[PDB]
Amino acid sequence: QTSAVQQKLAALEKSSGGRLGVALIDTADNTQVLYRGDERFPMCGTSKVMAAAAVLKQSETQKQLLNQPVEIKPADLVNYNPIAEKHVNGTMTLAELSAAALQYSDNTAMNKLIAQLGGPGGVTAFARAIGDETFRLDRTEPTLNTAIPGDPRDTTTPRAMAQTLRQLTLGHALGETQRAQLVTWLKGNTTGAASIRAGLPTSWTVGDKTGAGDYGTTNDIAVIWPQGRAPLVLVTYFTQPQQNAESRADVLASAARIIAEGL
Numbered sequence: 001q002t003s004a005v006q007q008k009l010a011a012l013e014k015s016s017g018g019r020l021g022v023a024l025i026d027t028a029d030n031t032q033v034l035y036r037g038d039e040r041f042p043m044c045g046t047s048k049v050m051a052a053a054a055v056l057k058q059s060e061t062q063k064q065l066l067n068q069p070v071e072i073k074p075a076d077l078v079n080y081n082p083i084a085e086k087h088v089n090g091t092m093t094l095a096e097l098s099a100a101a102l103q104y105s106d107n108t109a110m111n112k113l114i115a116q117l118g119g120p121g122g123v124t125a126f127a128r129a130i131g132d133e134t135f136r137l138d139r140t141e142p143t144l145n146t147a148i149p150g151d152p153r154d155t156t157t158p159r160a161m162a163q164t165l166r167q168l169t170l171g172h173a174l175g176e177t178q179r180a181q182l183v184t185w186l187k188g189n190t191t192g193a194a195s196i197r198a199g200l201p202t203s204w205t206v207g208d209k210t211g212a213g214d215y216g217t218t219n220d221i222a223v224i225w226p227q228g229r230a231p232l233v234l235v236t237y238f239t240q241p242q243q244n245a246e247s248r249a250d251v252l253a254s255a256a257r258i259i260a261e262g263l
Contacts, residue, residue, distance in 0.1 A: 216245025
């Protein structure tokens with residue numbers, strides 16, 4: 001029994017040609033708005049939030065951990081390494097790797113975070129530890145972005161990812177310093193101008209992490225501080241039938257525009 005919000009999202013999906021998943025949490029009253037909220041979608045780089053958060057969690061007991069330099073070898077480079085390529089035969093700290101993964105979508109940086117956690121299963125284990133029973137990371141970069149229809153690897157649901165992002169950024173899944181650090185990283189993201197941010201009032205403060213993959217997969221997850229209102233969490237996932245489909249950041253902006261009405 002759908003609301004006008006869900007009806008608008010359905011119409012957007014229909015016009016888009018793809019499959020759209022949305023979850024909004026309004027922390028003012030703890031209400032949720034879902035569209036395909038319990039269907040799995042390929043996370044792509046939105047999974048980098050869970051990896052960075054897992055390393056932040058480790059640093060709560062190893063307080064110098066974020067300062068630890070990690071070697072970058074030529075063999076480490078994958079398909080998109082805008083920051084890591086500046087440190088070949090050099091190092092980046094775990095803080096620097098987190099910033100590069102989150103703010104520049106650096107795939108080599110993500111692989112170093114995954115390795116720090118003992119492999120993709122270590123990222124999943126962190127998810128389970130904070131009560132995310134849905135998230136799964138199975139692969140490293142770049143194969144975690146294959147986004148094959150029906151493939152459960154490297155997927156989650158919009159509802160689960162919104163709940164997790166809320167707990168990480170507004171709740172207390174992380175310690176106080178670590179939560180603030182994650183918020184700082186998300187706020188400074190460089191890759192999201194055309195996605196959720198493009199559909200929200202410009203006065204609203206936003207932290208986000210985008211995702212991109214095959215099948216024209218175009219994702220964004222955001223924590224949002226609206227004007228004179230309690231914060232929101234918004235997940236917008238989008239994937240398409242053709243392996244070689246072009247990105248559709250505009251669909252995410254449009255979903256955000258719909259969701260923002262009345263808020």
